[PDB]
């Protein structure tokens with residue numbers, strides 16, 4: 001049930017406080033610019049922005065390498081811009097159900113919680129994504145850390161992407 | 165805060181992930197599709213407009229606060245009539261920027277925080293909503309509770325609808 005897909009979630013760290021700080025006029029411009037940045041970078045990695053969930057986006061890729069490369073590029077771009085917003089990025093892969101312009105299923109929820117575990121400026125991936133990229137000549141991960149994810153039983157090991 | 169005055173309602177299913185894990189994707193997708201249909205129908209009955217589906221819920225715009233509250237009341241009633249789904253409902257009003265079929269601004273964020281504060285089966289409204297319904301619209305509230313909302317300074321008094 002469901003087609004295999006790689007799901008990437010983004011989320012701006014403390015976006016409400018930011019909005020309150022800079023005001024709605026500045027916020028609308030900021031988020032408009034951010035939307036364009038993400039959309040552009042996703043299309044460069046042949047991804048698809050499924051929808052804008054909260055202060056971020058749900059993005060679908062066919063291959064985990066594309067998702068990680070996208071996340072790496074986004075974090076680089078946001079760092080360049082600051083010279084400020086920090087974004088969390090989470091990536092998970094598995095089967096999920098398509099419904100119009102949306103994806104449903106436990107693996108969508110899992111991807112969202114992986115992103116929620118990430119610090120601002122960090123890209124976290126689930127164990128299946130890390131394992132799928134175990135032999136990448138360019139992508140590098142840390143040793144991972146164990147967490148429990150809301151709504152799920154057991155423990156999960158999440159891995160941070162180490163970019164050059 | 166900028167834009168036009170709008171009443172924003174958020175719905176959010178309580179512990180939807182645990183529910184999904186319990187019944188599986190096949191059953192969950194069937195359940196959420198049914199739920200989407202239910203919410204859409206009830207929103208339209210009160211002249212509301214579903215702006216988008218935020219998480220396992222919806223962001224909905226209404227012109228008047230009584231419309232939003234009546235929608236919430238009817239939704240909670242319908243879910244009770246009904247694999248059990250409990251939903252938090254939060255309602256706030258204020259100026260927000262409406263562009264590209266979306267709503268932006270601090271009052272959107274505030275509405276989301278109000279919904280997050282609500283218990284499953286509860287309809288919580290901000291003080292501006294409560295004050296706007298002081299007239300006999302056939303709606304009653306509790307005495308309110310004072311809480312901190314993430315991202316905002318100070319406290320806010322939120323009122324539960326007594327249906």
Ligand SMILES: Nc1nc2c(ncn2[C@@H]2O[C@H](COP(=O)(O)OP(=O)(O)OP(=O)(O)O)[C@@H](O)[C@H]2O)c(=O)[nH]1
Nearest residue numbers: 012013014015016017054055218219272273276315
């Ligand atoms: N919770 C929720 N938020 C939504 C929804 N739709 C749009 N949003 C937006 O998502 C934002 C929610 O902020 P959060 O990400 O939960 O919290 P934050 O202020 O960024 O703080 P962090 O915990 O660091 O992320 C609001 O500003 C809303 O405008 C929705 O359906 N549910």
Ligand SMILES: Nc1nc2c(ncn2[C@@H]2O[C@H](COP(=O)(O)OP(=O)(O)OP(=O)(O)O)[C@@H](O)[C@H]2O)c(=O)[nH]1
Nearest residue numbers: 053054108109112151177178179180181182219220
């Ligand atoms: N966090 C987050 N979730 C999203 C987003 N877009 C869609 N979702 C879905 O919304 C659901 C979020 O789960 P939560 O509402 O935070 O948690 P829950 O399991 O319902 O438990 P509660 O805290 O009681 O609501 C998941 O099923 C996600 O797949 C998004 O942009 N951010």
Ligand SMILES: [Ca+2]
Nearest residue numbers: 011012015055
């Ligand atoms: Ca955020």
Ligand SMILES: [Ca+2]
Nearest residue numbers: 176177180220
């Ligand atoms: Ca929920």
Ligand SMILES: [Cl-]
Nearest residue numbers: 113148149150
């Ligand atoms: Cl979590």
